[PDB]
Design a binder for this molecule. Structure first.
Ligand SMILES: CC(C)(C)OC(=O)N[C@H]1CCCCC/C=C\[C@@H]2C[C@@]2(C(=O)NS(=O)(=O)C2CC2)NC(=O)[C@@H]2C[C@@H](Oc3nc4ccccc4nc3-c3cccs3)CN2C1=O
Ligand SMILES: [Zn+2]
Length: 198
């Protein structure tokens, strides 16, 4: 018992910058700082923007702020705390059945507004800051207008699907692939987030 180890915190290591005319990834913390921050849970770095790049000791993926909550996937974060300036912060939402978790949005982040447009022309933002057109095909599915090898999408779970006006429509969860080629994406609809927020 005395030697039982503790899982580290999720650490914000960068962001997908969407503030200007050009989307691009920025790293804000390197690997050594990330490992140390994961162990302490103390992250004094300034946070900006809507889409964060996040890491554990073993995985890297995305997290998206909507309605003052930073949301990501359970298959990436598990039940982990997130590092913050005052120490680790416990999840405020956890739903393994939806593959969804959330923490209070960090100070300095900006939140996306849930979409109320009813529009099916969407855009997926990847961890490499690609903005991919996606046609909505159901409550939780959308098709890529140009298929991609699944390599292209690996590490983008937790990122947003957006409407033409930049509202959040969903959180990217899984790639739908045949023979390694992604022709569609599965996502957590923002309404499911809004319900989880009871
Ligand atoms: C069968 C269907 C049609 C749904 O499609 C698939 O399942 N296709 C699979 C193909 C996997 C091959 C790689 C695809 C590329 C990118 C993928 C975008 C990402 C991604 O980037 N991940 S990541 O960032 O690299 C990682 C964080 C570091 N997503 C995944 O890889 C998802 C994880 C897991 O699904 C779950 N795993 C778990 C594990 C524990 C607890 C709950 C749980 N619930 C889950 C779900 C409930 C509903 C849908 S999934 C399977 N994934 C899929 O995509
Ligand atoms: Zn909208």
């Amino acid at each position: 018992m005395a030697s039982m180890k503790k899982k580290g915190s999720v650490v914000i290591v960068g962001r997908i910058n969407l503030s200007g005319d050009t989307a691009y990834a920025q790293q804000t913390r390197g690997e050594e700082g990330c490992q140390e921050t994961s162990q302490t849970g103390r992250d004094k770095n300034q946070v900006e923007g809507e889409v964060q790049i996040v890491s554990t000791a073993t995985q890297t993926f995305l997290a998206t702020s909507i309605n003052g909550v930073l949301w990501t996937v359970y298959h990436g974060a598990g039940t982990r705390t997130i590092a913050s300036p005052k120490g680790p912060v416990t999840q405020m939402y956890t739903n393994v059945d939806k593959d969804l978790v959330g923490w209070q949005a960090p100070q300095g982040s900006r939140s996306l507004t849930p979409c109320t447009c009813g529009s099916s022309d969407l855009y997926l933002v990847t961890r490499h800051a690609d903005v991919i057109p996606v046609r909505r095909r159901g409550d939780s599915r959308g098709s890529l207008l140009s298929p991609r090898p699944i390599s292209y999408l690996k590490g983008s779970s937790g990122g947003p699907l957006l409407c033409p006006a930049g509202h959040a429509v969903g959180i990217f969860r899984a790639a739908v692939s045949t023979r390694g080629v992604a022709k569609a994406v599965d996502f957590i609809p923002v309404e499911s987030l809004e319900t989880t927020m009871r």
